[PDB]
Q: What sequence folds into this?
């Protein structure tokens, strides 16, 4: 992996490993998300980092508020995927990270992703607008003119997701994180929520369709000892679903989202 | 990755990715096992496969009966691990696959593993013992003189594991496989059982110790709709006896032992 010539984006090639392919005989949505995270971490490392020394001082961290992924073609075991990632400031609202996924052999775009990140105090969990000092620290590593993975004036990455109404059409109850679902900082990995949302999609859809689009809003972190319920209702050749992740007990919302699936 | 000069073993280098590192700030036992599987798959592919066309006709598959892993040093995020793997016939009993893990920079052995594989009919689930026809087709890819990752005459990898007696000292109940725990053939992958066994190790041990040895016996496959209980009792460095069983009838799926060293 390496930063591109202008030092304003990073590119890396990844082989799809055997343990990364699912029932569909190709990489899963979760494998794609894992690869997006890995290329994002390597980009931040290549420029001396997520947190600047000013953020560490004030106990501030970047947290994902929204993730939007669209896949046109899933790579098979042994295929090489080339991913280009970059960051951009969004004024005082937060930061955005975008990705372009390509087939290494054909050079064609096989997927694209975008994510909204907000600033939060690590301890109190209180969100805050980006200060001017923090803004200038990461602006030197970002393109100045807007560069969007989803440029379109009325695309699907900026749609507001409604809250699922009870009764849900489908559900998967009592989902618990395992010790493997935790990262280096003992927190539940953002990829785990993608898996949990897909747990309540009916088996028939999983067997005959491929996920084309996924939009996921993050509302609350799930602790190691929390239990989650995954809820899904069809909202629609193509199937659409509205999703809701909530705590098994009090029903406190942790995530909401939408998925769009295409017939194999 | 590539086969070595004699074509009797395969070597590959792997970078440890960010999503592969755990609470310990290093690769997990599950990440190591995933890397062993990947290098094993690439070795079978490099020689045209690990079912031969004769096994395919008769509906026979190789199944793991025992897995034994020993880790001396866990790689950190971004570290490159070099793994060498090879196979060997064990008469009519089955096959063995061994691995040697090395640090790419220092060349030192950071871990080693061994596994016993038995022949089974994928439909009836019946053990069948290895035929003579299926032997001459895989012996051409195996070293002829014995080559053992664990050579020591009666060491840790060949110790019989006893069955845990109730009440268990520790337990983690209601463990269900997710759709991500299934492989390309819709089966629960063998790495998932390693995770489930480690779920009942006390948090105190996990936070202050590193796993040094793991021996896991496979008795029954867990289906997508099965629920499992993970049981652990200290038998002692800390040693544990483990048992995975179905949440309902208590039907055994796995038994094992772990040895942990203070960080
Ligand atoms: C059906 C699989 C199995 C795991 C659960 C969901 N899946 C995916 O993430 C996927 C993979 N490829 C295409 C579309 N979706
Ligand atoms: C404690 C971690 C966290 C995940 C569950 C078990 N662990 C390991 O697999 C491990 C064990 N020893 C050293 C490094 N990692």
A:
């Amino acid at each position: 992996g390496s930063l591109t010539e202008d030092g304003l984006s990073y590119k890396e090639k990844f082989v799809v490993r055997s343990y990364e392919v699912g029932s569909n005989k190709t990489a899963t949505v979760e494998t794609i998300a894992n690869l997006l995270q890995e290329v994002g971490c390597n980009h931040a490392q290549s420029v001396g980092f997520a947190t600047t020394t000013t953020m560490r001082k004030l106990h501030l961290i970047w947290v994902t508020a929204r993730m939007h992924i669209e896949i046109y073609k899933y790579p098979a075991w042994g295929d090489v995927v080339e991913i280009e990632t970059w960051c951009q400031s969004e004024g005082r609202i937060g930061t955005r990270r975008d990705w372009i996924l390509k087939d290494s052999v054909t050079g064609e775009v096989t997927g694209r992703a975008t994510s909204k990140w907000v600033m939060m105090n690590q301890d109190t969990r209180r969100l805050q607008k980006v200060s001017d000092d923090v803004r200038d620290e990461y602006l030197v590593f970002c393109p100045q003119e807007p560069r969007l993975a989803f440029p379109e004036e009325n695309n699907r990455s900026l749609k507001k997701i409604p809250k699922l109404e009870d009764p849900a059409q489908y559900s998967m109850i009592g989902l618990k994180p395992r010790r493997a679902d935790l990262d280096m900082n003992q927190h539940v990995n953002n990829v785990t929520y993608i898996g949990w949302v897909l747990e309540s999609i009916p088996q028939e859809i999983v067997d005959t369709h491929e996920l084309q689009v996924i939009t996921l809003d993050y509302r609350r972190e799930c602790q190691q000892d929390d239990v989650v319920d995954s809820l899904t209702t069809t909202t629609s050749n193509d199937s659409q679903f509205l999703h809701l992740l909530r705590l098994s007990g009090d029903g406190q919302e942790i995530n909401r989202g939408t998925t769009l699936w295409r017939k194999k």
In short: Residues A 179-180; B 22-24, 26, 28-30, 74, 198, 206, 210-211 surround A1BMV (ligand 2) (CB under 6 Å). Chain A touches chain B through 33 residues (CB under 8 Å). Chain A is about 15% helix and 35% strand. The helical segments of chain A are 29-46, 53-57, 132-139, 190-198, 203-208.
